[PDB]
Design a protein around this nucleic acid. Structure first.
Length: 68
DNA sequence: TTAGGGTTAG
């Protein structure tokens, strides 16, 4: 069954595959990086004010999460 | 792989 243990973002260590929640404190719209994939940058914050950065890579915009 | 948020001088 579907499950998610939302936990303060600081606990999300490298190599871990996680299910999370947060407000977007800052983000860049999808832009083409040196690589082949457009990179969208997102800074997210949870209810405990803890932060996480996300780099969302895709060859196009539509494949990425929808944020405005 | 890249990038991995913060002012151009147009």
């Amino acid at each position: 069954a579907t499950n998610y243990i939302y936990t303060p973002l600081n606990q999300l260590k490298g190599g871990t595959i996680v299910n999370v929640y947060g407000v977007v404190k800052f983000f860049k719209p999808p832009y083409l990086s040196k690589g082949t994939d457009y990179c969208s940058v997102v800074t997210i914050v949870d209810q405990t004010n803890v932060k996480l950065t996300c780099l969302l890579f895709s060859g196009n915009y539509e494949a990425l999460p929808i944020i405005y």
